[PDB]
Amino acid sequence: MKPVTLYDVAEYAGVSYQTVSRVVNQASHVSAKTREKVEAAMAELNYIPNRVAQQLAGKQSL
Amino acid sequence: MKPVTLYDVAEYAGVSYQTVSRVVNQASHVSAKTREKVEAAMAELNYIPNRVAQQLAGKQSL
DNA sequence: GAATTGTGAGCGCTCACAATTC
DNA sequence: GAATTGTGAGCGCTCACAATTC
């Protein structure tokens, strides 16, 4: 329906886009503190990431 | 298996990448002359484009 | 003025180096 | 010296302006 982006979530929560994707796509080095603030952004705007973007950039196979 | 790129085909046939995508993805403004030279490049290297690239870049919906 | 063509620029999601922090 | 963070940079395929062509 309406896509949203990692940047839209980031801008809303007042964080970085790498802060966002830690929560979303399960990365490591952020914090538990900031995690929950991103979880709020996802909820408001209703973040749908693009699976296409997740595949294209999602690193090549070694 | 092994993906190839529009650039790889282009470089082989000695053309532009937009020259390539005309033949591949059915564009307009090239020629019939050059068309068949691209067709030869696809055949050698075995051009498999990425459907993901074609989707992500494949213009937003209006 | 519309077909042909060259160069910059972008989807949104990820990577990489180096500064920062201690 | 490794976790945390900021700025630049890229996957490959597609678009946009303007120069070229006549």
Q: What angle do CA B57, A10, A1 make, to 5 degrees?
A: 50
Distance CA A47, CA A49 (A): 6
Residue to mutate among B2, B56, B60, with most A CBs inside 10 A, is B56
Task: Give me A17's structure tokens.
Answer: 């886009």
Do A52 and B52 count as a contact with CB atoms less than 8 A apart? yes
User: How remote is the C-alpha of B37 from its chain's centroid?
Assistant: 12
Q: Would you tell me how many other CB atoms lie within 10 Å of the CB of residue A32?
A: 6
Q: How was this structure determined?
A: NMR
Sign of the dihedral through C-alpha A40, A45, A50, A51: positive
List residues of A whose CB lies inside 8 A of any B CB. 50, 52-53, 55-56
Q: Go through the domains of chain B in sequence order and give each one's CATH number.
A: 1-62 (1.10.260.40)
Q: Kindly report the nearest CA distance between residue A20 and chain B, in angstroms.
A: 21
Q: Kindly report the nearest CA distance between residue B51 and chain A, in angstroms.
A: 9
Amino acid at A26: Q
The pair phi, psi for residue A18, each rounded to 5°, is -80, -20
Are the C-beta atoms of residues A38 and A19 closer than 8 Å to each other? yes
Rg (CA), chain B: 12
